[PDB]
Amino acid sequence: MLNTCYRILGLKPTVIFADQIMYTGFAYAARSGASVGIDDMVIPEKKHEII
Amino acid sequence: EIKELLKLGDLPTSGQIRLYDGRTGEQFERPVTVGYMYMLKLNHLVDDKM
Amino acid sequence: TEFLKPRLVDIEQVSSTHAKVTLEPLERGFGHTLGNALRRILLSSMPGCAVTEVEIDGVLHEYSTKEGVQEDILEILLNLKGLAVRVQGKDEVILTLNKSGIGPVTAADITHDGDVEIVKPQHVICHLTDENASISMRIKVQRGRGYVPASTRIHSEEDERPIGRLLVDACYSPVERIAYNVEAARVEQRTDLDKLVIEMETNGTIDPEEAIRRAATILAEQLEAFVD
Amino acid sequence: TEFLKPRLVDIEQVSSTHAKVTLEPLERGFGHTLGNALRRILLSSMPGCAVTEVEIDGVLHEYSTKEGVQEDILEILLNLKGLAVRVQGKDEVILTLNKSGIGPVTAADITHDGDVEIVKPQHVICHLTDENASISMRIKVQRGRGYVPASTRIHSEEDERPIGRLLVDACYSPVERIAYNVEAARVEQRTDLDKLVIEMETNGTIDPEEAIRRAATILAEQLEAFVDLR
Amino acid sequence: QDVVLGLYYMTRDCVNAKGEGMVLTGPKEAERLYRSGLASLHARVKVRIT
Incomplete structure (x- = not known):
C-alpha cells in the first residue's frame, strides 16, 4: 500500500495517509477489543481416551 | 478445582465478564478475562534509574 | 467550583457545503461528549x-x-x-x-x-x-x-x-457526513485540557454553521425544562 | 416543542452516614445525548x-x-x-x-x-x-x-x-459512590417516556436533594455561558 | 503489531452478525450506521464507490 502510494503519488499523501491509518487502526483496535481466556486453549473431549 | 471454586463464588466459570468503557459508557465487543494476580514491586525504579 | 468554557476559535471552510471547525479549550471530559452528542443530533434529527x-x-x-x-x-x-x-x-x-x-x-x-x-x-x-x-x-x-x-x-x-x-x-436531513475529533489543548500549566475539532460536509439546503447552530439550539430547547 | 421537567420525589437514606434519592421524570429524544452529557458531568461534578x-x-x-x-x-x-x-x-x-x-x-x-x-x-x-x-x-x-x-x-x-x-x-466524605437507572415512564399513552432513579451513597453531612439542587443550579449557571452567551 | 491487528479486524467479512445486503450510497452512512450501532463493520453489504 505505502509502496504503491509512494510510487505513483510521490510521497506526501503516503505520509498523511499512513498517519491516518496508524490513527484509525489504533482507535478502533481499542474499540475492537482483544484479550485471551483459558478456553481459548482447549480441554478436548478426547483426553481420557487418548490416555 | 478452580472452576468449581470460582462458581462457588457465583462468578463466571472462566471469570470472563462483560466490561464497560466509561469514556462513552458502552460495552466493548467481547467479554474479558477478569481476576486477581499477585504482583511484585522492585528496587528497579525510574527513581533508581533516572 | 472553577469552570472553563471554550473559545470557538476558527471555522475553516472549503466550500459552501464543506466546512471545518476547531473548538478550544475544553477541560478533559467534554470533547467526546460534545462530539458524540452533536454528531447524534445532526445526523439523526435535523429537518x-x-x-x-x-x-x-x-x-x-x-x-x-x-x-x-x-x-x-x-x-x-x-x-x-x-x-x-x-x-x-x-x-x-x-x-x-x-x-x-x-x-x-x-x-x-x-x-x-x-x-x-x-x-x-x-x-x-x-x-x-x-x-x-x-x-x-x-x-x-x-x-x-x-x-x-x-x-x-x-x-x-x-x-x-x-x-x-x-x-x-x-x-x-440535508447532512451527509459528520466526524469529530477531541484533541489536546495546552493551557500554560494544563496540557490535560481537551478541544473538539470537527468537519462536516452536507448537501446544499443549509449553512453547516447554521446546522450545528440549530442542533445546539434544539438541544437547548429540550434542556430548558431541566434548567428548572 | 415537547419538553418535560425533572421533579424530585423521595430521599431514602439507609443510614446516618448515607443518602439516596428517587428522581423523575424524563423523556425520550436527545435523551442519550442528554444521557452521556448528564452522566459524564454527574461523574465529574460529583464531588x-x-x-x-x-x-x-x-x-x-x-x-x-x-x-x-x-x-x-x-x-x-x-x-x-x-x-x-x-x-x-x-x-x-x-x-x-x-x-x-x-x-x-x-x-x-x-x-x-x-x-x-x-x-x-x-x-x-x-x-x-x-x-x-x-x-x-x-x-x-x-x-x-x-x-x-x-x-x-x-x-x-x-x-x-x-x-x-x-x-x-x-x-x-458525603459522596462515596453512585449509580442510576432509566425506567420507562408510564404516561397512559406515552409509556416509553423515561423515569430515572439515582442511587446515591455518601457519608452523612449532605442532604442529597441539596446535592441535586446544587447540581441543577450549577448546570443552569454553566449553560448561561451557552444560552445567554452564544 | 497493533494497527495491523486493528485494520485486520476492521475490513473483515463475516456472515453471522447482521445487516446483510442492503445498500449504501457511500461510506458516510457506513460510518453513520456503524457509529450509530446498526451495521456490522464486518459484513459484505452493497454500497456505492466513486
Whole structure:
C-alpha cells in the first residue's frame, strides 16, 4: 500500500495517509477489543481416551 | 478445582465478564478475562534509574 | 467550583457545503461528549425537505428501463437522491417534469412551484440517448427530518402504491457526513485540557454553521425544562 | 416543542452516614445525548471535595517525622484521610495539634475549633516513643475545591506555598459512590417516556436533594455561558 | 503489531452478525450506521464507490 502510494503519488499523501491509518487502526483496535481466556486453549473431549 | 471454586463464588466459570468503557459508557465487543494476580514491586525504579 | 468554557476559535471552510471547525479549550471530559452528542443530533434529527415518491409516464418498477436513455431506473433514483430540494411554504410539493430531446437531465428543467427550492438546478438526473426519447414525470418533495429507507417505509406503508408509484430512502436531513475529533489543548500549566475539532460536509439546503447552530439550539430547547 | 421537567420525589437514606434519592421524570429524544452529557458531568461534578491538607512543624527540622515517631509521614496522613469531620456553618476550616510524651497520639488532643464536630476522638494519628520525643503539627481539614486529588490540584495550581505544607489526596466524605437507572415512564399513552432513579451513597453531612439542587443550579449557571452567551 | 491487528479486524467479512445486503450510497452512512450501532463493520453489504 505505502509502496504503491509512494510510487505513483510521490510521497506526501503516503505520509498523511499512513498517519491516518496508524490513527484509525489504533482507535478502533481499542474499540475492537482483544484479550485471551483459558478456553481459548482447549480441554478436548478426547483426553481420557487418548490416555 | 478452580472452576468449581470460582462458581462457588457465583462468578463466571472462566471469570470472563462483560466490561464497560466509561469514556462513552458502552460495552466493548467481547467479554474479558477478569481476576486477581499477585504482583511484585522492585528496587528497579525510574527513581533508581533516572 | 472553577469552570472553563471554550473559545470557538476558527471555522475553516472549503466550500459552501464543506466546512471545518476547531473548538478550544475544553477541560478533559467534554470533547467526546460534545462530539458524540452533536454528531447524534445532526445526523439523526435535523429537518429538511427531500424527495419521497415518484410518478413518471410509462413506469412500473425499478428493474425495467427506458429505451433511448443512458440510465436505468436505479441510476436515476440515485440521481434523485442527489437532488437538493427545499419546499418553502409547504412541507410537501409535487413537481412536474416533462422532457424530450437528447437532454442530460439536469434538475434545472423541472417546472417549479414558487414554494420549492432546488439548490442544484444543474443536478443531473437521467438522460435521453435519443431525441426521439421523451418523458413526462412528476416529483413529490416532502419535508421531514433524518433518514428513513423506503424499505422501512413500505414495511410501514399499508397504503398500496401502484406499480409506477415507486418508493425510495429519504434524506430529509440535508447532512451527509459528520466526524469529530477531541484533541489536546495546552493551557500554560494544563496540557490535560481537551478541544473538539470537527468537519462536516452536507448537501446544499443549509449553512453547516447554521446546522450545528440549530442542533445546539434544539438541544437547548429540550434542556430548558431541566434548567428548572 | 415537547419538553418535560425533572421533579424530585423521595430521599431514602439507609443510614446516618448515607443518602439516596428517587428522581423523575424524563423523556425520550436527545435523551442519550442528554444521557452521556448528564452522566459524564454527574461523574465529574460529583464531588463536594472535602479533605485537604496538613502542615507539620515541630521539635526538629520540619520535613517531617523527627526522632521518636513510629509513623513515617504518609501513614499519619493516611490515618487522617479516614478522619471524619463535619462543618456546619462555614465551608472552610483549619485545625492544629500538639502532643508529647509516650503514648498514642489521637484526635482528642486536637485543638478542635468550636464549630467543628469531631465524630471519632479515637481515630489514631501517630505514636510517641522516646521519653525525649515530642510532636507538634497542623492539619488542614476540608473545603477543597473542584475535584480529586493533590496531583491534579497542583497540575492546576501554579501557586507555590510557603513552608510546612504537606499536600494530600482527597478521599472525602458525603459522596462515596453512585449509580442510576432509566425506567420507562408510564404516561397512559406515552409509556416509553423515561423515569430515572439515582442511587446515591455518601457519608452523612449532605442532604442529597441539596446535592441535586446544587447540581441543577450549577448546570443552569454553566449553560448561561451557552444560552445567554452564544 | 497493533494497527495491523486493528485494520485486520476492521475490513473483515463475516456472515453471522447482521445487516446483510442492503445498500449504501457511500461510506458516510457506513460510518453513520456503524457509529450509530446498526451495521456490522464486518459484513459484505452493497454500497456505492466513486
